Symmetry: C3
């Protein structure tokens, strides 16, 4: 329920907090118009996650969901966090490659669908339906990753080499991390219940910090953010 | 309640699904910057409606509301769908006529008001208050339609003839379809109860498919989306 | 609960309504691209507040929250109103000073955090935690005000004198009004309970009208909105 995994919630909260502070301070030594944006976007991600992880720790971002004839504790704040941060991660990749607005809306819309349906499946009472949503959500994610490889990478190459290369790595990071989420939900308590809520929370905290601080450390330590 | 109108919910879900797939495939043969946007926007509308109609079918996008001394089943997901799609429909008309940002915000804000207040009235427990919201919502809609005729049409004429003409028809379609919604809510169970929830659901499914697939078919089969 | 402060709710609703109508009519005599935006943005703020104050009056935007071993009535619609209007107020200041997009996102993100966490603390059941949220929210507000003085004012001076001066006053107004909110929440029933819900509602209605109509009257009666 809400006791065993508090340590992961607390570690997550601390890591997001420290991460947000490191980016704030680091962003002071910046005045380049375009550099700001990457900093503004990359510092906001963990600021939000910080409040979301804190809300789960204190017990506000949690709710019980009845299914499989049981009362399962669902951390809805985990999805609320994802609803606002993933589209911002997509934006960094978008600015990085100079993506057209038409492409930006497509990704954001698919991203909102991905999270929105994942949340619906998290809260769904009927067992089998739960996986229908996990399937729709998963498709949106592949759609997103399909664009990042067949509508982004091809363009980054048409840009400065430092940008194409940084983007290439950030894209690669994204494929690995994002794809890891649906797998965790499927083996966890929200889905198949092959692993307890305790290890499910830990796994997502590891993934969230990696994507919300780790990914930030890579992008923000790159010259790909300045126009030279 | 949630049994009689399932056929309309299922037909709606299927029609939105097939519609989304047709636009995805059709959008592959497109690379024009501005063409993308119309495709990105027009394909996302039914993608979302699809998930919303599926959520109503499975019973997740439904809730019971007490009023008139009765327990009335309210499909809140129907409004959730509208909250995200109507502003996107407005965007197609906006891009189509090259509308200024000031005008775009006005329409979107009024649109969010229109749906937001319609939802409040859908969920309202006190009978008479329900119609106060229907009235505020309806005013926002006329405001929107007033701009599409006295702040849009006049400009489309100052653009390419194919655009002005396509916009003219799309505007005309919008007046007829949008205005049809408040009328349906008033005679339906959510409002006057002059017609059962069964026919209310059917009527809105017909309208939603028309606006989410039909309207798309018209816009996307037009040269008004390319810059020549 | 929901009876004593209805007069403030009704006065608030009326003032926001009349305010919205005054701006609509006033905005008709405007065609300047940039003038529209200030009008579009400044007229939408009270349009929304109007619906929010009306929802509190009728009793829809209210909910009871258990804490301190008591059932406290929380006007969640007050925060819902703030969630959409404050970012729009920030936009007026942003357009006014020609702020970069990177700076705009930072402010909006911090603003959404400020309100989001204030709402969490409003709804929080555990007494001490409530103030943790008030503290996080308050920090975001100072962050916002810190940017309006060390990332905005310095630029407005690099613009036309009428803009710099109007912005200077609008900034000054913002510092005074915004800072007044957290103080009210702390002494009110949602926080310390040093003053009844009756006076808490009155105080916020006074502040809301000032920021949603008052501030509008100042900005819209200024030439700082036209490009000359
Ligand atoms: C906070 C940062 C990131 C990158 C979060 C990413 C989350 C996902 C990619 C989540 C995906 C899901 C899928 C595809 C289907 C099951 C439900 C999830 C919401 C966990
Ligand atoms: C999904 C596509 C469209 C075009 C949906 C449009 C919906 C409306 C115009 C709804 C309007 C309403 C009004 C004006 C007042 C009563 C409540 C409604 C939300 C049904
Ligand atoms: C409607 C217009 C305005 C300017 C509203 C402003 C509201 C605030 C600045 C609210 C701030 C809060 C803080 C900083 C912390 C306690 C909770 C509040 C949400 C009241």
């Amino acid at each position: 329920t809400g006791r065993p995994e508090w340590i992961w919630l607390a570690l997550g909260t601390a890591l997001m907090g420290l991460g947000t502070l490191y980016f704030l301070v680091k962003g002071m030594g910046v005045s380049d118009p375009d550099a700001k944006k990457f900093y503004a976007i990359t510092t906001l991600v963990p600021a939000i996650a910080f409040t979301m992880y804190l809300s789960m720790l204190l017990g506000y971002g949690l709710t019980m969901v009845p299914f499989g004839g049981e009362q399962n504790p669902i951390y809805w704040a985990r999805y609320a966090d994802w609803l606002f941060t993933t589209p911002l991660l997509l934006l960094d990749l978008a600015l990085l490659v100079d993506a057209d607005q038409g492409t930006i809306l497509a990704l954001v819309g698919a991203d909102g669908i991905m999270i929105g349906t994942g949340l619906v499946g998290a809260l769904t009472k009927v067992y089998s339906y739960r996986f229908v949503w996990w399937a729709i959500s998963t498709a949106a994610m592949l759609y997103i990753l399909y664009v990042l490889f067949f509508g982004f990478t091809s363009k980054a190459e048409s840009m400065r080499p430092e940008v194409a290369s940084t983007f290439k790595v950030l894209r690669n990071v994204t494929v690995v991390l994002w794809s890891a989420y649906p797998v965790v939900w499927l083996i966890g308590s929200e889905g198949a219940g092959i692993v307890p809520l305790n290890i499910e929370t830990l796994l997502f905290m590891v993934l969230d910090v990696s994507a919300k601080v780790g990914f930030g450390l890579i992008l923000l330590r790159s010259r790909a953010i300045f126009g030279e």
